[PDB]
């Protein structure tokens, strides 16, 4: 099971550190599985409230949310699932998510009313805006939709040509990093 363990660990780490943004509801599904993997089947006589160090089973934005009740429910819900079954399920859940395999940056946008954070994610196929809190995918642009791109030290910008009206502009210090990624994905196609 070497490669399955390598997969699970990658996917678990990326979720646990925010590399792979997941909704709170999904954070607890993942944790539920992690509980099964690390403690076996749930046993009320042994898994008492307060015993779960949330820093080790949840992304940090969600520790404040007092979701131990939610985690123990998902942990109970696993029944007598084997460790390896839980790992296959953990990986399948991660991969079932639009956000899987997506490099993200946390950036601030402007709206029609104060600058709001937003997760900007890049892959080889597209570029997406994703809700920084709910993680719902709110806009998806194919890479062939990008006329041109530009990076400041304190900004990143996309020009979509005839596909959207008005440039997409964004406060970020990683602007040169976002664009480096995009250029590399362009280079492979040609």
């Amino acid at each position: 099971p070497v490669q399955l363990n390598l997969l699970y660990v990658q996917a678990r780490d990326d979720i646990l550190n925010g590399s792979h943004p997941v909704s709170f509801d999904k954070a607890c599904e993942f944790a539920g599985y992690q509980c099964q993997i690390q403690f076996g089947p749930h046993n009320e006589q042994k898994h008492k409230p307060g015993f779960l160090e949330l820093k080790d089973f949840l992304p940090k934005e969600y520790i404040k949310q007092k979701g131990e009740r939610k985690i123990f429910m998902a942990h109970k819900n696993c029944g007598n699932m084997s460790e390896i079954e839980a790992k296959v399920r953990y990986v399948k859940l991660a991969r079932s998510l639009k956000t899987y395999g997506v490099s993200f940056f946390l950036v601030k946008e402007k709206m029609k009313g104060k600058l709001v954070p937003r997760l900007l994610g890049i892959t080889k196929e597209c570029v997406m805006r994703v809700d920084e809190k709910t993680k719902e995918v709110i806009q998806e642009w194919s890479l062939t939709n990008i006329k041109r791109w530009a990076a400041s030290p304190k900004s990143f910008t996309l020009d979509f040509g005839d596909y959207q009206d008005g440039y997409y502009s964004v406060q970020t210090t990683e602007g040169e990093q976002i664009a480096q990624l995009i250029a590399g994905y362009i280079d492979i196609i040609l």
Partner: peptide
Amino acid sequence: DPFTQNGYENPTYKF
């Protein structure tokens, strides 16, 4: 080289 597009990977490798 041949694994740049339809590169499917095997979760049972060295299981």
